[model samples]
Structure formats: C-alpha cells, structure tokens
Target: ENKLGRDIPRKYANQYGVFEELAHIKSYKESSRQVKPVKPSDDKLLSSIHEAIEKTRLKDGMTISFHHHFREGDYVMNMVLDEIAKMGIKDISIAPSSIANVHEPLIDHIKNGVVTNITSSGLRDKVGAAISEGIMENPVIIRSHGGRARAIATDDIHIDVAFLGAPSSDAYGNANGTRGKTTCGSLGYAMIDAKYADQVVIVTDTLVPYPNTPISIPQTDVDYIVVVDAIGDPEGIAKGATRYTKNPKELLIAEYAAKVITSSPYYKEGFSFQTGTGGASLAVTRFMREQMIKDDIKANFALGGITNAMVELLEEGLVDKILDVQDFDHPSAVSLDRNAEKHYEIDANMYASPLSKGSVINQLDICVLSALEVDTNFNVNVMTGSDGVIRGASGGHCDTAFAAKMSLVISPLVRGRIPTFVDKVNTVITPGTSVDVVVTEVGIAINPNRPDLIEYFKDLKVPQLTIEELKEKAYAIVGNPQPIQYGDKIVALIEYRDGSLIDVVRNVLE
Candidate 1:
C-alpha cells in the first residue's frame, strides 16, 4: 500500500504488521486465569550482563530491546551488545527506544551478522552515517516514540528480552530514575518495555535497599537484576538543559513564535502546550510565560520532554500541571521527586500514540517544534542533515504535530550560510498539512491550508510573509545549496504517527 507518497514494502508489512489508517480506538478483553510464578527468594541479583543473558535463555533470532534515557553517556547498550557478541549470538533484532552516537560500536555487530535487523527512533553520528551507507541487508525501521510503544503493545515488535539500564534498583527489582548518582529522570519509556517484554533485566549501577521507594518499574515486571559498576554518566543525560538564547537572531525568531501563539485563537486560559529542547524552542516558553502572566491566562498543563524552564512555570503557578514523559535536566528530575502532585509521569502510549484512544498531545492547544530544515511546502525535516547523513531523531516531532490544534515549526532563516528554508526538504519528518505556522527571524508564515489562521493573523503585528517569500528571502541571503548526491539503495524508513511509511532515506554518496 502507498502511504504519504512512500511505498509500503510487502516484506515490511509481513514482518511488522501493516499500518492502520483510521483513528478509532479499541479496548482489549482481559483474562484472569493466567498464573504467574511468585519469587521464592530475594535473590534476583546477577553479577554480570552475561549471567542475565544466560538467565533469559536467549538464542539466535530472538528480539532484544533497550532504552535511551542515558543518551550519549550510556554504557549499558554497548556493554550488553559486547557480551552478546562474545556469546556468538547472531541474527538478532535490536528494538531500542533510540540509538545514540556512543553506540557506534554497533557497526561492527551489523557487519558480523550479530545484529541482522534493527529498529529504533534515532540513529546518530557514525552508526547513522554507516547505516546511510547501507551496512545491513534490511533497511533500519525508524519510528517515533509513541509508534514504538504501539508496536510493542500490538505484537508488531515482540520483544523476547529487554535489558533496561536503571539509575537505581533494588535486589528485588523495584527501580526509579530519580534517586541514583546518574539520574536521567522519568523512566516512562522503560516502563512499557518492562510491562510487555517476556523477560525483563534490571541493570543498575546503584543498588538501593530491597524496597526501592517511588518505583518506576515494579518488582513484578522484572525477572533478573544485574549490578554494573556504572550504567551511564550523568553528563549525557540531556546534552545539558536548554539555556536562553543570547543570539539576537534566535531570540527574534522566538519572539515572533511567541507572538503568533498568543495572537492565535488557541492561546487562552487553561490551554496546553509542548515544546522541544532547542535553544530557540526553549526560549519560546520564556516569551510565552510573559504573555501568560500579562493576560492572566494560566496554562492547564505542559507536556513532553520536561526541562527546568517548564518546571519553573509549574512552580510559579503559571502552569498548573506538567505531564513529563522524559526529564532533560537536574531541576526537572528534582521537581518530579519533590513535587509529586503537579508533576506527573506518563507512558509513551498515553503521551502521543495515534493508536491510543486519546493522548495528552490531543489536548494540546499548541506545539512548538524545531526543524533541521523546512520546505517551501512547509513539510519539516528533523532527521537528516543538509549533508544527507542521519544525525537526528524522529522523537515525537510528528506525533504532537498531528495531534495538536496548531503546530508551530520554529527555525532560523539560515544556519550560518546554509538556508533552512529549502525548496524541498531532504527528508519529510512531518507533513506540511499538520504544520500550521513557520516562525523565523525574518517573518512568520502561516500555512495557506490554515485559512482560519491566515484570516486571524491578517491584522496581526508580526511580519506576515508567505512561505515562498520566506524561502526567497533565505536564498537571497545565503544562496541556494548544492543538493546532496544520494545512492539508489534505501537505508532508513521513516514511519508516521499512524505507522504508515512517510519517507525513505537512501544511502549517502560513498
């Protein structure tokens, strides 16, 4: 079937179930006859990853999964893959939440046939470039955060074993991300893996007492526990928090984005929003907060990757609630720990899965998203760079954009000398139809499809320019860029929120 102008290969449909296009929800019937074995003793602890792997009785052709809360500082994925390599396991499928730059070692595993199939949200640095060069027989299956959870739950990507790296865990397997030395905050992503995986292994650097308080993953869901010297470094938990942008150009873009939101029909009392962690994206909150205070229009909730900036709004009573799926900084984690009532944890499915009956994003009045590049059609690219190499993640870029009432895509007119406003994006991560407005330093361009917004912003104060005008303004300053030379072989498949094929990324010229 064709979806979003990309071919849905029959092999992919046969392997992973085909995407369902409709938006209706279904509830599963429950059975209470199943009996689970109770732990006879308090000895679930293992000395090494090898021991845990052995306990899972993993064999060739089985699927394994991991979570990416630790980001680049992660040692767990590499350490576990090394043991699997030493065990001589081959033809394995890895279903991680995302892959980072630190996982460059996976290239060797792919070459040696240890990893036969791969699926994840993001691929970064060397590994991504290697994949772009077609290192494996099958194209890597790329998914958004919510899509992954839906896949796992729907038996599309059945996980035989899940090796989750927790910051703190008890011997009995109760775990949380807030108490340990290397905190990555909410374990929302891992919670889904623990619930669904056949065998769950808790790998942690810090071993707390038997009853770990504020459990993110309960003991019932865990099968084995492995204590490592260090699961990950805290430095990579978030690439540092999103700081205020001192760049006049970025601040102008942010100011314009904020004005567009406040001037729109959605910016009223009890509204909800989600923003990315980019410099200008984060600065939008500061600008929006000022408007909220001035108009006394308090937001009901803020969602997605929580940062200290969002937490401050929660603390100051400007926002009443924070629905956090992942925490990007120390203060956000601290807020999750200290403020339990207003700060809530949410699973990926409840966050933005299209398959879910309703997601927090569906209730969002506005969403502020960042893009690597955007086409004159307003289609956004958050995955591939101008070089045609993979350096970004799909994350929730498409999910929230599709669910929110108004999706605002924010970017600079030009990054250095590269024009961000292109005639055609190298990869379309979010379709133009879902994006309502484009905010740049030079001007604000409302999508022509959104006639309501076009009419509403007609008399607005911000500089209103057509998307084509914005692209021309950008090209006039930076000049047009040389198109990237791409190979015929497809390397990555981009999936939309509904699990349909949105675009395919071909191999970069080698």
Candidate 2:
C-alpha cells in the first residue's frame, strides 16, 4: 500500500513499487542520447513527417515523443500518428509531454495497435475516459511534469525519436515556440526530450532562415526537420487555461485563498509563487495582486504554467520575472518573445524535478493549486473525476504543492451536486502530507501537520474549520458521495516526482 492508504496490487506493485517519501532527492547520472556527427555542409531538412519518421527509423515498440505546446490547438500529434499508423508501425509507445482533447484520434491509433504504450503528464477528455475504460491491454502511466523530466534524465522512460512541433524553425532545425502562425510559447518540455532522445525531429509550419533567432530547441540537439503548413490553431492556444469567471462562489474561494496567503509568513518581500490554471486560481492572482499593491509589495518572481494573469502582474511591475515552462495563452508567448530577459523559459527538470540539480519549485514561497477533491486529511486529487473515470491531469499539482513553503488548494465546497471535500479523495495526486491549507468557498482548513500555520491563522477573519468540519459542510450540502464502481484492472499508474507509485487509478466498472 502507498502512504495515501491505497492498495497497489502486486501486478502494479511489482512494476512500480511504492513511495519512499516526498521529495526523495538523490543523484542521477544524466541519461545520454545517440548523436550523429554532421559535416559542416550536411543538410538536415526533410520533405515531410513521413520522411522524418522514415529517416529517424522509428519502429514497433519504440517510444516517440511530442510536447503539448499547442494544447487544444495542436495538429502535430494527429498528423504524425496518422503517418505512423499508415507506415504499419505497431505497438509504438507515444511519450508526449501531455495529451490534449484535440488528440482524440489517439483512440483510433490505440485500437489499431499503431500506438500501444503511453506516458504523459495528462490524458484528456475522450482519451482519458477511454483509458479509464481499459482502452488498451496495458495501463497508461501518468507523470508529474517534473517527474516526466526526471524519467527522461534517468532513462526510466527512454525516447527513440523526439518529434517536436515548433511554430518557427530554421531549415537546419534550430527551432523556437514564439513566432509564425501557431506560436505556443516555451518549448521547455521539448528541450529535455531533445537532449535524451536517440534522434530528435523538429517539425514546423514556418521555416526561418539558416539560423533561427531565439532558439528554444537548438540545431545541435535536433536531427531532422519537417515543414508543414500550420502546426496548430492559434486561437485555441489560449482557450481553457484562462477562462473568465464572475461566479460569486468562485470569487469567494479566491478571496479566502488570497487572505490565507497574505496572512502567511511566506508572503513577505521578494516572495515567489505559482498559481493554478483554474477559475478560482486565476481569481486568486487578481485578489492577491490587489493585496500586494495595497502593501506596496512587489514579488521577486513568478513560476508558471504561464497565464496572462501572471503577465498582468509582470506587466504592471508587480512581479520581477516569470520563469515559464508552459504558456497557456498567446500573450504569454508574446511576453516570452518581447521581454526575452524577464519572461524566461525553462525546462521541466529545472522547473520542478526533485532529483535534478535544483528546481524553481524548491525556491517557491507559495502556490495555489486546484483540485477535483480534497479529503478531510488534506490529500488532494487532481487526476480522476468522482465517477472514477480519468478526466484530469497530474501536471505540477504534486510537484509545486510539496516544494512550496506554503501550498493552498482552492475549490468550491462542491462542484455542482458533487462535494469537493471528501472522507477520502478519489485519488491522492498531492498527498495530504504536503498540503498546508484547503480553501473552499465557505471556509479554509489548515492541515493538522502544520501547527505553525494552524496557530498563525487562528484569529483570522476567514472561518477556521477543522478539515472534518469542512467535509461535513460539503457532505451536508451535497449528501454523501456515492462510491464509484471500480474493476480489478488498474488502468493508470500515477508516478510521483521521484518515480514512486503514489497512487493508482482503477478502471471504472462498465
């Protein structure tokens, strides 16, 4: 059993083992890649993704990777998987940084055996549901963003071909994410993949001159180049990451989270933080900004899955810098290109990897993360819906929640008829031990582990309920949560940042 109180049947237990502890730091010899020496005059450009795939020599059972810079806007994964399928490559492993709703055709690929194994930070919508329904014989492996980086560096997960979709690139394969028709800024995740993959393929819709400026993925790391018409739809790049909300409940949840933050010891001068890409989370950014402005305090830096709410603070000089691993919108991309110095891009390893040299998450003062469910113990679930179907992501929820000085999980008391605070979460992505506070629309609860925090906010204006009290309030409003019917098959294995099996998602019973 994992520390979160879930049993890992020997089937998975033998494969993944179990957790040692949070932030189990250790030394790792960086995984190496195959590099072919190119003459000064050698050409790297290829005609199509097919040519790039053929040249990379991808085969059955070998892993191919892609970064989800484009999110829902992405066309690269579908296009490439189609080619891989047409080429009759069976049992291929796709190890993208994440899979999005746009990549639903992945279901067809999985069924056809063109794709077999999967590893990613997330699986979304239909694909995620399909996984929960046991779409493949093998279960999917979910990694935190930092965890994925760690896996690549340690060879826990190896890549044969790293196929990256960049908005702009040189014909010689130097590429960046901040130009052309479909710019989704920060190729941070791809940078790691490029380093360790046996061969790296850089695909682009726009080919700049010989030497592409602002090279996010360098020519030295890239092996082949494939140029296409449009890599993604620019409009969809900013879609769900920054949804505007006027819901009073959502606003109040942010209000309490902001209040808890300012009351905490970590909210001093030069403090750094990362906010979730959720309705309540983005609201906290605005509310927290006002509080900082009231006190004339400016943040030293911000770390992110970059959103304009952060840029709004950065543009106003409320934040000194934004270390971006992923940008949610076009403005953040523009910010990356325009202010190349302040709005810097970084790889996932440096952003959150626990075993790397260091990580931005370690230096973070505070972070407000979102949750699908928060148990009375403060264990947070961001991966599966209450129905027991996989619908969410591992992302950096566990990474930042554990590393930050103070981690606040924000949510409404209930999502519609479903309660947010539960007797036990559906799955614990951010284990209760790391979570400091749980913020609901009605009140906030400090975990019992932090007596310092529980004492610090004792007299605060916000209601200071015990975690159980908070759960009772949710249950009172929504009635008791019905148990999900789960099958014997575990459909997904949740890998913690240090390669520990923190939790597992079983297939929903049909």
Candidate 2 versus the native: TM-score? 0.97
Please, what are the lDDT tens digits per residue for candidate 2 over residues 49-81? 999889888888899999998888888899999
Encode model 1's per-residue lDDT on 1-510: one tens digit a residue: 543444546665555445433345566432121124655864789989999989778999999999988888889999998899999999999999999989999999999999988888899888898998889888888899988977777666688889999999999889998888788888888888888888899899899988998889999888889998889975666345557889888889889999988998988899999877767888998899999988888999999999989998998999999998888877787788888979988878788777766788889999999999988778889889989998788899988888889999999988988889988888877888889999998889999999999999998998889999989998998898988898878788877667666677888987
Q: Extract clashing residue pairs from model 2.
A: none
lDDT of all predictions: 0.85, 0.87
Give stretches of model 2 more than 4 Å off. Answer: 238-244
| Worst 10-residue lDDT window, candidate 1 | 28-37
Runs in model 1 with CA error above 4 Å?
1-36, 237-242
Instruction: Highest TM-score: give the candidate number.
Output: 2
- Assess the local accuracy of residue 264 in candidate 2 as a C-alpha lDDT between 0 and 100: 91
